[PDB]
């Protein structure tokens, strides 16, 4: 099984104030999101979803489609030791 970590870059400054930029109902526009956490430093926030495949190559094709559907646009990196594809925005 392979996995897709969809990630966004956060800037953060016990309440923790952060922000990231997200695409909007218009695809060529991005808007800074007011994100707070309650119990500048840069952080990466990810969520991971799944698939089974025969190939590291077939898994990418699938995950690429997933991301394209969801509107995730970023850099793609792969680590075969943990068989994890990552898409990072920002």
């Amino acid at each position: 099984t392979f996995k897709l970590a969809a990630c966004v870059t956060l800037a953060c400054t016990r309440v923790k104030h952060c922000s990231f930029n997200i695409t909007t109902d218009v695809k060529d526009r991005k808007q800074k999101v007011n994100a707070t956490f309650y119990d500048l430093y840069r952080l990466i926030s990810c969520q991971t979803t799944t698939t089974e495949a025969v190939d590291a190559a077939t898994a990418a094709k699938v995950f690429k489609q997933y991301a394209n559907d969801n509107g995730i646009d970023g850099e793609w990196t792969y680590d075969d030791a943990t068989k994890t594809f990552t898409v990072t925005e920002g």
Partner: antibody, heavy 136, light 110 residues
């Protein structure tokens, strides 16, 4: 885009006055705004700036905190609350728009929280000004 | 602390003049955010240069701007009668305040 100041007048030192500025012809709630003043025969002096959503404001040392900027976006109005007035506050007061828009990079237009404009660091619309004269 | 400008400059029509605007590393020297305003009697000022060297749409190509270290400059070439007026520089500062220069009266000797 038009800005129209009012509330100016002839007053005595120690008094208070509230200036208003009615904005029209642009989306007031997305743009930063300033007050700038000019005493008769003298130079421009920046008074204060307020962020589009009113979440942050800044004032010159010479006027903090006798003169305070605020805004009401539901009324497209900018205010300057002037307390403890001094003769040296005598000036024309201009309401002024901070030029602004998206930050364009990597093929994307980036906007601030709630779609607010980023600042372009120059002033692109001015009212005609309102006169304040402070004298004993 | 106001940015330092000469009190006055003057030139004949067709000549070039330059007005300086001296600040510190926390304003003029710290950002590419110097703008310049022309003001005629009884009117609001009007921007003629921003971001050091950029012209707003419609502003004559005779107006140009530059900066080196903590000093910015506005140059007006091919002086015309209508250039006469007062000129003010402005900069963003490190505390997000703004600050104007002391202003310069330009006379076009017509």
């Amino acid at each position: 885009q038009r800005l129209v100041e009012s509330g100016g007048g002839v007053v005595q030192p120690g008094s208070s006055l509230r200036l208003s500025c009615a904005a029209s012809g642009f989306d007031f709630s997305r743009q930063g705004m300033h007050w700038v003043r000019q005493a008769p025969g003298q130079g421009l002096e920046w008074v204060a700036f307020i962020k589009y959503d009113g979440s942050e404001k800044y004032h010159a040392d010479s006027v903090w905190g006798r003169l305070s900027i605020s805004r009401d976006n539901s009324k497209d109005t900018l205010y300057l609350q002037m307390n403890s007035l001094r003769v040296e506050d005598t000036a024309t007061y201009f309401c002024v728009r901070e030029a602004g828009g998206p930050d364009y990079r990597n093929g994307y237009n980036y906007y601030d929280f709630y779609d607010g404009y980023y600042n372009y660091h120059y002033m692109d619309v001015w009212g005609k000004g309102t006169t304040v004269t402070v004298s004993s | 602390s106001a940015l330092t400008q000469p009190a006055s400059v003057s030139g004949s029509p067709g000549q070039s003049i330059t007005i300086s605007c001296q600040g510190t590393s926390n304003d003029v020297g710290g950002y590419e955010s110097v703008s310049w305003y022309q003001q005629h009697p009884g009117k609001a000022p009007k921007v003629v240069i921003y971001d050091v060297s950029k012209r707003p749409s419609g502003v004559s190509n005779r107006f140009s701007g530059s900066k080196s270290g903590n000093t910015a400059s506005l140059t007006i070439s091919g002086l015309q009668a209508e250039d006469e007026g007062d000129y003010y520089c402005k900069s963003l500062t490190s505390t997000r305040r703004r600050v104007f220069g002391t202003g310069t009266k330009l006379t076009v000797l017509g």
